[model samples]
Target: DVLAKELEDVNKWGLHVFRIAELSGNRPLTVIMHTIFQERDLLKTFKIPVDTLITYLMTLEDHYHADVAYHNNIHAADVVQSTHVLLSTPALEAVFTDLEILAAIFASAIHDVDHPGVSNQFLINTNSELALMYNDSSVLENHHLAVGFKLLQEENCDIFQNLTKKQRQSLRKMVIDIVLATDMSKHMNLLADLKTMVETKKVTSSGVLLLDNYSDRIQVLQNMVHCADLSNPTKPLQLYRQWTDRIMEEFFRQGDRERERGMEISPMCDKHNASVEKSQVGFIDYIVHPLWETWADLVHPDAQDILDTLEDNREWYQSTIPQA
Candidate 1:
């Protein structure tokens, strides 16, 4: 399948670069390359693109100008890896079939490819071209979807070459739905749905889902990706710190652009003056925590480690002092 082929592509490219970098003392590339390959491959059970999908992903890596630390290929790899881990939950085993699994895994890897390094609000607030194209709603998500699909038009990116026309059509729709749902604007709705599902609480004897409808199946997968997307703060302390540094740097860079354009710097954008702890505290309290809390109930034990990581990271941030 296209998803499996795409993963193969990412793996090969990453391993090649990683091996070369290792021999040349450029070890930093090793972390990202290995992570990307490992993450993409771990979801191999879903059998998404293993080669051609990497064409677009690699293209984005080569052309996009965002920071190497964050808004780059590395973060895409991270999200994909996180998504794979999330899918291993026993609670999700029966609910999602291979198709839904493939959709979620592919969606995560390509979700932020060619990202503009700007948030949805930034696109709207600045009236970006993307904002105009998508009618100012979910602009970042729309841009991501466009770039991802556009990449597939080329022969090199025809990862869907194996699928029948009807299968391709269904895959396209599912991928689009999941990718567009990643917009932070939809965070509330996604989480709300998950919470509602958890509140109703269904379970089978084998600990698998007995979801009776397409909407229910897809909603679970959607929330899985959503949780994975915001999973940075729930990673190991050292790793989470690295992500925090990258995100803050990206925010600062955007803030600088806003300042140059005579626009007000948003809360997380002020690199020099940002209170990292305060900002993250707010991000968690209002955004990350609530979502993960609900997700924890859905997957239970599979998410316990992640929940611990999230709390640990938040406590670390909360324990910090603002710069005077």
Candidate 2:
């Protein structure tokens, strides 16, 4: 009940996953997910049996590869928590259906499953099997999707077994779109269209978003999970630094692998020369800020606190950069 009480705090936003992991007996994914599904009443509506969900979530968490510093189960928990809160944006009220809400949170949970803590470019350049399978296009994203869904096909793990065939298919399709949109290659395209939508925005009398079609609906949720995916910089200072360290370690590991293979090391991969602080600052300037700004426009006034926190966190890291 205490875990549930703490999780209920802040409407499930910006949870300290590292602590939650410890509190949940090192299975934060299962704990956070089971809580969300129950609290959202997705179990009753979808007719998902408690044992079925438990089996699915438990194994799903296993597939996350705990050794991976950045893309492990805690990151999955963090993203899902952020996605949950983002979906609750005051202006976003009544904008998404229960089915869509389930998809968004599920997409966040599985988006980085089985991640190798390396880039898609690393996979392609190294001739990794996954790159060949996906033709070097969204390789990791495709892998996560495949592995996550594959779990649902197993015994006692069919969480959607109660859904109609059409509903099952619809859920799969929505999940795919939401997961694939997290690929960095898709970021620019997704943001452009999001900004376009913001420029020509439509709203209800109560000021909620009016997504006119499937494309628009999924596009907004794509940005929703993507915003949460990049939300590390927007978290409070201690939480933000913890994610930074995890990712920095992952990048360094990639650089080490490239060295072992006698290949050119990727930018942001080399740890020795990695200006950890400056990298965070530049990442914020180039990618994270622009996306959040556009998304803030779409869900006006609600995410201003996030925007402000991101800027403050950026300054915190920027001030730590070494002077020439």
Candidate 3:
């Protein structure tokens, strides 16, 4: 239970998956996921066979390409841990049903499964097999969903087997919706919906926020997962920088591939020309800050610390830029 105890220590916000991966014997995804499932008491509630569930999770973990620099099992584990923290926020704590909670965690765990260590644009431009398979539409995300669920279909891995038909259908749909919403191309639309929710947010007489409809509920969960997906900036600076290093390396590799194939290299992917500090600053300024600002507004005081850390990291990256 060493892995279990280690997970307990880092289950909160700012979890460093790299450290967790080291502690868990490289089974970070399975360890963290199984920890969450047990903490939530999901196995007994859902009547899931524990052995089968672990097998399924291990198989799902294996599907994540370890060679990928960023979108590997460690990132998936980090996102799941982040999602756990997000769901624990007071505003969201009681709103999601057990089923929705399961969907959110599951979606986070498999969001980038089998990622090819390249961008969706890279796949489409190069006519990669996955691009053809998904018709160039959210190609990587689509593939991740398909591959993850396909593993669940195995007789020894069908964790949903005990659930009723309606429960299975609902879980399947929510997982698909949340995972697909992780695609960056869908970022604007998702953020717009979240902004609208904050504008018209409802509250109970006791002051708890209300999500009375399926559309509203799913939209909020989508945004929650999206926040976790981009949570690197909000993490502790050291952990944040580690993630930046990995992602930049991945981007640079993709850029090298592009150059070899005579394609236009992506802006932040050209290792020789790219400024890691500048890219981090722009990414935070343009994407991470705005998203977290809206999210902190949604959750009020609960997310203030997260927003503060994000600002601090922004300053750190800003300071790294050479003076003109």
How much is 208 displaced in model 3, in angstroms? 2.0
Off by over 4 Å in 3: 1-4, 322-324
Q: Model 1: residues >4 Å from true position, as ranges?
A: 1-57, 63-69, 322-324
RMSD of every candidate to native, in Å, equals 5.8, 1.4, 1.3
> lDDT tens digits, residues 186-248, model 1?
888888888899988778888776688878877887888888788877866766777788888
Of 1 and 3, the candidate ahead on lDDT is 3
Q: Give the C-alpha miss distance for residue 243 in model 3, angstroms.
A: 0.4
* Model 2 TM-score, all chains together: 0.97
Q: Write the per-residue lDDT of candidate 3 for residues 1-324, one digit (tens) a residue.
A: 655556765557876678789987788899888888998899998998999989998999998888898989999999998998899888776889999999999899989999989999889888888899989999988888999889998768998888999999999999999999999999988888889889999877666679998898899899999999999999998899899999998999999999998889988989889988888899999999999999998888789999999999999989967778
> Per-residue lDDT for 1-324 in model 2, tens only?
556666766364567777878878878989888888887899999999999999999999999887898999999989998998998898889888888999999999999999988999999998989999999999999999999999998889998888889888888999999999999998899989989999998899999988879988998899999999999999888888899999999999999999899988898899778788888899999999999988888888998989999988888887867666
C-alpha lDDT of residue 86 in model 1: 76
Worst 10 residues of 3 by lDDT: 2-11
